[PDB]
Amino acid sequence: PITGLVYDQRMMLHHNMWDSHHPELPQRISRIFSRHEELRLLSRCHRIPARLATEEELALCHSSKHISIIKSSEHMKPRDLNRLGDEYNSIFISNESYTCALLAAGSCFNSAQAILTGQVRNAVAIVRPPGHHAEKDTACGFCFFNTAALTARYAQSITRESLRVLIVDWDVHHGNGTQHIFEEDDSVLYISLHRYEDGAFFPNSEDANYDKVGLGKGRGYNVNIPWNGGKMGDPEYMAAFHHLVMPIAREFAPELVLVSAGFDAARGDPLGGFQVTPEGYAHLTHQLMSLAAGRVLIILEGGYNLTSISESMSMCTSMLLGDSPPSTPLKTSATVSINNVLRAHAPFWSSLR
Ligand SMILES: CC(C)N(Cc1ccc(C(=O)NO)cc1)S(=O)(=O)c1cc(F)c(F)c(F)c1F
Ligand SMILES: [K+]
Ligand SMILES: [K+]
Ligand SMILES: [Zn+2]
């Protein structure tokens, strides 16, 4: 009945040479770690060591070319780091970026290992850079390799290839890379909540809309819950979990739950525009703990208000440790969104009928 925690300050070395105020700050992870200490959560966890992902583990989800190109940045001069970064959508690169992305992924592998070997029940991974925009063949949106996707495949690689993994992605952005990597896969259920605004919200693709339900054997195993019409918060997220995430997840009956846990839907986030509270994130975590015999790994993705993400992710760890959850009409467009997803997925999930 133990909660694992992974954090390594080396992941702070990834930085933006040209704009030291870029919102994907090194101190994102140290602020979260400090708040865990400050709230006396750290001493209640089992510390799991960070490690580098291997290049063969990266090949679970990424092409050898993508791996080689990102690895080549390790010794690039600033001019070439700027040029390579600019070939992607919203990427900055320093000489330490590749190392840090390996550390983020390997830390989560070690956390998934600790859960699956029974050394801990659940775990939290305070990692950067994030992962969920990363595609098989390209970097995107502050992400180099798809940490959560890789962790799902790593978990399958040490148990069975068809181990049922649920990925709940509550970062305010669509995890396009995660969706694409698993789009034909019935072993990995991807559920994303994200601001959409009819394609105007980053990453600006109709791939994030509710009618993208998966392909082939994966049809039904991709659930997009897209928000339109401005600011959402706890009522909308609790409703989406009650009508959609939890009924589908229970029917899927995952053997492992990964949370792509960006905290940029948080109150105070400058990039998400939403108002999910730390208590709200606590309740979302508490709900997910009812799945997979409690085998839940929470993985930091985005989230840019340092105070918001520190309080929100700490509230999640508090829930993993077994603490009692803390203590409103939906916006009309949120009801429309939830009903659109319900109609899209009732063909595949009996719990929605
Ligand atoms: C496009 C916009 C949404 N951004 C990129 C982004 C990507 C991923 C996440 C995330 O959290 N994904 O899960 C959050 C933000 S930006 O930060 O505001 C931004 C930063 C810059 F440095 C720029 F030069 C620039 F033009 C710019 F738009
Ligand atoms: K998401
Ligand atoms: K899928
Ligand atoms: Zn995000």
Author numbering: 442 to 768, 773 to 798
Sentences from the paper on this structure:
The X-ray crystal structure of the HDAC6–NN-390 complex, which was solved at 1.6 Å resolution, displays a similar profile of contacts in the catalytic tunnel when compared to that of HDAC6-ricolinostat complex. Unlike that of the HDAC6-TO-317 complex, the hydroxamate moiety coordinates to the catalytic Zn2+ ion in a bidentate fashion. The hydroxamate N-O group coordinates to Zn2+ with an average separation of 2.2 Å and the hydroxamate C=O group with a distance of 2.34 Å. Alongside these contacts, interaction of NN-390 completes the canonical 5-membered chelate complex via a hydrogen bond network. The chelate complex involves the side chains Y745 (O—O distance = 2.44 Å), H574 (N—N distance = 2.62 Å), and H573 (N—O distance = 2.47 Å), the latter of which is unobserved for TO-317. The hydroxamate moiety of NN-390 is further able to engage in hydrophobic interactions with D612, D705, and H614, similar to that of ricolinostat. The H614 side chain makes Van der Waals contacts with the benzyl group of the phenylhydroxamate moiety and the isopropyl side group in NN-390, the latter of which is mediated via a water molecule. The benzyl group is sandwiched between F583 and F643 and establishes π-π stacking interactions. The F583 side chain alongside L712 chain also engages in Van der Waals contacts with one of the oxygen atoms of the sulfonamide moiety. Although relatively weakly resolved, and likely more dynamic, the tetra-fluorobenzene (TFB) capping group is observed to make weak interactions with the side chain of H463 and that of S531 and F583 via distinct water molecules.
